[PDB]
Design a protein around this ligand. Structure first.
Ligand code: T8V
Ligand code: T8V
Lengths: 304, 304
């Protein structure tokens, strides 16, 4: 019993983290096979970030200008290219610790683990979600860029995020491992404001199911609702519209608890309208929206 | 910027987890050098747990009855002994992945990372605290026993917890790596109730400092207090008494923010008396007490 905000074990990713230095800029890279992936802004001074022309800045950079260090051993750079907002540094050594891996582009509401790194060294691991406004709420200091977000399916690491940017609102923006930003964000120090950070309704319901499974039941009520009625309330509270696809995804948790999805929607409706009244659910005073239905099933069944 | 509930990178501990089977009981063991550490109740049937005589149960067990599996390779058991509530299984192979390590016994209020395992395989990592009632609020299913809690100082893993027990209240009890339970708990299926789960005051104040550092300042007020006045309020709210030792520990965060510890105590006093009024601090609607002052400084300075 118990339900914690749980990251994937980080060992497979720890084995992939290198230090990348270009001039006075040091950040992190991801070493898979004989390629090191890092944010392209590794080539920028802070002054450059105001209005960088990356193709023009890149012309002044040679393979020997990209200093790549794995532990205390230097990697030889034999080639480099820009793909969207990442650099691919070809090195002469395949990472011997390369795990089975995929590059995946996640959707808003999907959770992932972040291995926060500085100078190619792991500092910690935490669980994030791709927010509906395509930001993430991370913990990232200067030097943390090139830290990656990932899921594990048994032995295969799916890399979904590389850290690039802090908005002035202190939220985070980054790319998939093809270097495409999530959302409308760009690797330039400009006016970029996040849109509405709406609540991931399907994730809250997953977490309410996790609460029932773990004995927290006080919020179960005598009511039901419909998708359309629930959605009128979701709108008002800046919750994502609940779709039949979400209802279908929640089916296994419905089955296990014997609580119809729409009944749990009616519980969530009362919690939105009435508040917690100073009570907690799974030790939280707000509705947690960074567990997916798949996260709940994983943690409640003990998948390794 | 940003402040997350952050675990240590788990790789060094992942490399230590084995499966231990005795009869029909499978749980996890920790393989360091040529010793595998596991809960002694590995020798019990569920029926035994009602009133186990461990010395008597152990007599019926030989080295060849302890099946120890690291990945898909079996380890040869060449000796076994009971130390308090753990078994030490001597194996003929030193774990080649043994990190630098210590066994440390932590105090209530100290945080640690848990690598939740099943069948010697990691499922996830999360951050816990030794509660003032010597429980922890974990996420542990059947099979999770022998999962360990740890801190890392650069390259040295300090093992502070091994998982043994779920109380009927769904909270967790376990031992240090010498097999001594935290608190008054025993490895028997009996009436054991947790005492008052008081809030770790020094940890809340640390986290309020983390909030200021990361831009959340709305709760800063015009007031101060004294340890004695604050403590009258702490008592009423089941918060741990704040000591001068705690004030001293918070000194660096005081220095960095320029907020006197006692001023931050007066902010915490108003928050206790007045509530959050539906506001959040670092995305939390309750006062977080599972960051130590050392955790805050670590995460805010990016230690690896
Ligand atoms: C994203 C990131 O870490 N960027 C950065 C900011 C300031 C200094 N160095 C770096 Cl890298
Ligand atoms: C502590 C733990 O994991 N114990 C347990 C309970 C039920 C079945 N197997 C085990 Cl091991």
């Amino acid at each position: 019993s118990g339900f914690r905000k749980m990251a994937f074990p980080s060992g497979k990713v720890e084995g992939c983290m290198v230090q990348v230095t270009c001039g006075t800029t040091t950040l992190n890279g991801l070493w898979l096979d004989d390629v090191v992936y890092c944010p392209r802004h590794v080539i920028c001074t802070s002054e450059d970030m105001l209005n960088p022309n990356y193709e023009d800045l890149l012309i002044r950079k040679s393979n020997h200008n990209f200093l790549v260090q794995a532990g205390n051993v230097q990697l030889r750079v034999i080639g480099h290219s820009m793909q969207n907002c990442v650099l691919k540094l070809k090195v002469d050594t395949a990472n011997p610790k390369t795990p089975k891996y995929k590059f995946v582009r996640i959707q808003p509401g999907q959770t992932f683990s972040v291995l926060a790194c500085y100078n190619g060294s792991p500092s910690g691991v935490y669980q994030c979600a791709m927010r509906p406004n395509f930001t993430i709420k991370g913990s990232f200091l200067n030097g943390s860029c090139g830290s990656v977000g990932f899921n594990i399916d048994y032995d295969c690491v799916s890399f979904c995020y590389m850290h690039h940017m802090e908005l002035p609102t202190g939220v985070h923006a980054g790319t998939d491992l093809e270097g495409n930003f999530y959302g409308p964000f760009v690797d330039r120090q400009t006016a970029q404001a996040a849109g509405t950070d709406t609540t991931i309704t399907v994730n809250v319901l997953a977490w309410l199911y996790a609460a029932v499974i773990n004995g927290d039941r006080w919020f179960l009520n005598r009511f039901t609702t419909t998708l359309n009625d629930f959605n009128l309330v979701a709108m008002k509270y800046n919750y994502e519209p609940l779709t039949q696809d979400h209802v279908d995804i929640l089916g296994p948790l419905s089955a296990q608890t014997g609580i119809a999805v729409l009944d749990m929607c009616a519980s969530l409706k009362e919690l939105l309208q009435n508040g917690m009244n100073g009570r907690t659910i799974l030790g939280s005073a707000l509705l947690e929206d960074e567990f997916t239905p798949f996260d709940v099933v994983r943690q409640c069944s003990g998948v390794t």
